[PDB]
Design a protein around this nucleic acid. Structure first.
Length: 97
RNA sequence: AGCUCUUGCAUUGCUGAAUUUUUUUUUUUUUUUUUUUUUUAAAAAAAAAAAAAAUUUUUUUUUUUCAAGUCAUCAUGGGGCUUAUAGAGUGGGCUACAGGCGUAUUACAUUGGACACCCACAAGUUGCCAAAACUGUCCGAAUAUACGGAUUGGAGUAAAAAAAAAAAAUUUUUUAAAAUUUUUUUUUUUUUUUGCUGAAACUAGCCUCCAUGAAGAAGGAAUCGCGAGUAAUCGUAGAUCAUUAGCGC
RNA sequence: GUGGCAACACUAUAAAUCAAAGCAAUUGGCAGCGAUAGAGAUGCGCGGUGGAAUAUGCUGUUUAAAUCGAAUUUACGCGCAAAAUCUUACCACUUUUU
């Protein structure tokens, strides 16, 4: 399915690098500025791409277009993990016990 | 070229079910004797005897049938679509709520609740951490109990540690007593504390603390599951995950 | 036609159709036919459900959409090992390219 559209979202997290967003987040998590955090947070999460915060990423699979049931254990999805596992074309993951 | 459009009765793949049990009876090594093939030699073959035994924390693994399920896993046959069955953007909805059903959890207490304890011993030191309980103490009036913890409002708050100087022998009762030899000033100072995480938590997260405290006093007909470290009970840690699993796995 | 008191007892062919009707040993499905083995297979126990509330899934109702499949056993803590936007395919609106 649409694995690449998420890669575009990941690229927007990094083209408009998260550092710029998080540094503005630093000044809104500081209570030292008495106010203007409302002004800083008023824009700067709206001029900043709303599709670049780190929650819109949904961590899809890479083999296929799986969007549900993924694994970071070996960057694959369950049915493929089983297919590669029985094939053994994977780093030594055997049937258990 | 693209479909998340159809067709699982066109399909590959993968799985469901119970067919719940069978997966040890079989070889190999050695000995003795002997014979089959090749211009100084190995295997081979045959009669008998003895031993080695059969993978993993103990389940996986081997299994027959349902046009069983899935075209939204991808794939792909056929058909359909291409100003829309194609892509974006913003916000919903995928979680709504007479009824009814399935699966779980929590109780309806005293074999218990609470609170403390030592903060009891684990799976789990490989390139330290619990709970039930044991010991102590409070509670047993149909109280709906100090059981239970559903719904609903409301609010997001305390400190503890100790250092240096000046002074020093002060605070509190009755009509006779009491606490300090540290009282009152300045400078200090840590460690926690901040509601959390996210851009945004009303619906619709979660946390903490108040308050309101529901049913429920063990459940018919009916029925399911399981005979040893098993049921039940008790935590624990892993996944996906910004956080959300309390009950799911 | 013969016998009888008869029920009828004989003797006795065909017309007409069909392409098999049959037979014996089996090999399988039945048992409302027995002997031997095995399963909490029961009657033997424990704990559940169904009673209450919450969670959670499904139908049904409505809504603009409540996206779509799973459908008796083996569907209903199922695809979802997680939906606040995104995931998301559904709707309202505004655009885009063939």
């Amino acid at each position: 399915r649409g694995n690449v559209k998420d890669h575009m979202r990941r690229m927007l997290v990094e083209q408009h690098e998260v550092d710029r967003s998080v540094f503005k987040a630093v000044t809104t998590d500081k209570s030292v500025p008495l106010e203007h955090r409302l002004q800083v947070q008023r824009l700067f999460e709206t001029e900043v791409p709303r599709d670049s915060a780190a929650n819109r990423v949904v961590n899809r699979c890479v083999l296929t277009g799986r969007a549900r049931g993924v694994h970071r254990f070996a960057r694959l999805s369950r049915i493929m993990i089983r297919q590669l596992a029985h094939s053994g074309f994977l780093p030594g993951v055997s049937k258990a016990s």
